[PDB]
């Protein structure tokens, strides 16, 4: 991958160091998941903590963000359209996506 | 850690 806010070389602590000493809730980036290998994590700052949402790549190249058990399966044909959705308030996250931390 | 894992809710 290719997008500016996707960091691939990036530990959890490193990302938390870059998200928290950012300032505003709404700081976000994408990184590789450490728990589910091959998955991604949308990470955003909110209330002095990072909130991570795993992203699964599926069969035909879809991106499937982890939704809870009472929320419809929500998939995106690419990654910028997933980030485009969560830039809008009240979409299911703890805070919407405001400030991209670039690599 | 200082990361909370969460799921989308809408």
From Swiss-Prot, chain A:
Organism name: Mus musculus (Mouse)
Q: Which residues form the SH2 domain?
A: 5-101
Q: Which GO terms describe its biological process?
A: adaptive immune response; leukocyte activation involved in immune response; natural killer cell inhibitory signaling pathway; natural killer cell mediated cytotoxicity; negative regulation of natural killer cell mediated cytotoxicity; negative regulation of type II interferon production; positive regulation of innate immune response; positive regulation of natural killer cell mediated cytotoxicity
* Entry protein name: SH2 domain-containing protein 1B
Q: Which GO terms describe its molecular function?
A: phosphotyrosine residue binding; signaling adaptor activity
Q: Which residues of the full protein are shown?
A: 1 to 103 of 132
Tissues with expression: Expressed in spleen, thymus, lung, kidney, heart, colon and small bowel. Expressed in NK cells (all stages of cell maturation), macrophages and dendritic cells.
What does the function comment of this entry state? Cytoplasmic adapter regulating receptors of the signaling lymphocytic activation molecule (SLAM) family such as CD84, SLAMF1, LY9 and CD244. In SLAM signaling seems to cooperate with SH2D1A/SAP. Plays a role in regulation of effector functions of natural killer (NK) cells by controlling signal transduction through CD244/2B4. However, conflicting results are reported which may reflect the use of different strain backgrounds.
Alphabetically list the UniProt keywords: Adaptive immunity, Immunity, Innate immunity, Phosphoprotein, SH2 domain
Q: Which gene encodes it?
A: Sh2d1b
Complexes and interactors: Binds to the phosphorylated receptors CD84, SLAMF1, LY9 and CD244. Does not bind to non-phosphorylated SLAMF1. Interacts with SLAMF7 (via ITSM phosphorylated on 'Tyr-302'). Interacts with Src kinases HCK, LYN, FYN, FGR and LCK (via kinase domains).
């Amino acid at each position: 991958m290719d997008l500016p806010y996707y960091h691939g070389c990036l530990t959890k602590r490193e990302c938390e160091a870059l998200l928290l000493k950012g300032g505003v809730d709404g700081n976000f980036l994408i990184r590789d998941s450490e728990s589910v290998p091959g998955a991604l994590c949308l990470c955003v700052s909110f209330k002095k903590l990072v909130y991570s949402y795993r992203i699964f790549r599926e069969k035909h190249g879809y991106y499937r963000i982890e939704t809870d058990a009472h929320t419809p399966r929500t998939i995106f044909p690419n990654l910028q359209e997933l980030v485009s959705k969560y830039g809008k308030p009240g979409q299911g996250l703890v805070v919407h996506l405001s400030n991209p931390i670039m690599r | 850690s200082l990361t909370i894992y969460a799921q989308v809710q809408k």
